[PDB]
Amino acid sequence: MAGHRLVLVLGDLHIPHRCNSLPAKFKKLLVPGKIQHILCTGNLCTKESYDYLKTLAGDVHIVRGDFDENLNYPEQKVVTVGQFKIGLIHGHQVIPWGDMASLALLQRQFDVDILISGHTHKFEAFEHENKFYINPGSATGAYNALETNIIPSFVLMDIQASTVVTYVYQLIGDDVKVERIEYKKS
C-alpha cells in the first residue's frame, strides 16, 4: 500500500452514555501504525474517546455532534486527501435524516467529491449522480433517535490516484463482515 492513503471514518460512538466501548473484534482490528487520517462524524462524546482516536493516528478530524461535550469542534469540515475533496458533517442538520436531496445540496455547497455524514447510525456508502456518499454508521452500535437494533460499523477509505476503495466493517452476529466498494473520480 505504498502511495495509498488510509482514512478511518467512524462516529456516533456515544461513549459512555449509550455504550461503554467499541466491540472487542473492532478493537482488535483498530491498532496503531496503519491509519494516516481519521475523519470522525462526532458524538464521541467525551475527551476519552478523542484520546483513543489519537492512539490510532496523528491526524484526527472531528465535527460537532449534537451530544458532543466539546463545543470547539466545527459544525462541518472540508479536507483534501489525494485527488478527493471530502466533506464532513454530523448530519443532525439534515431533515428528514439521510435525505438524499438534502445531502446532494450539501455536496454542491461544500463542492466535494465525497460527503461523509452520520446521525442515522445506519451504514451507507454509495454513488449517486457521480458523487460519493458515506455514512459509517455507529462504531459502537449505539441506539439512535428511533430504534435500538443498530449494526456496529465503521469504514476505511483506501485512496489512490482518482480511485477510493471503501472497506466497510460490520459486526453481524459476533463476526466481522468486510466488503469493498469502489468509487472513481471523473
Partner: peptide
C-alpha cells in the same frame, strides 16, 4: 485480503 487493509 480478507479484512482488507486491517488484515
Amino acid at each position: 485480503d480478507p479484512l482488507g487493509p486491517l488484515g
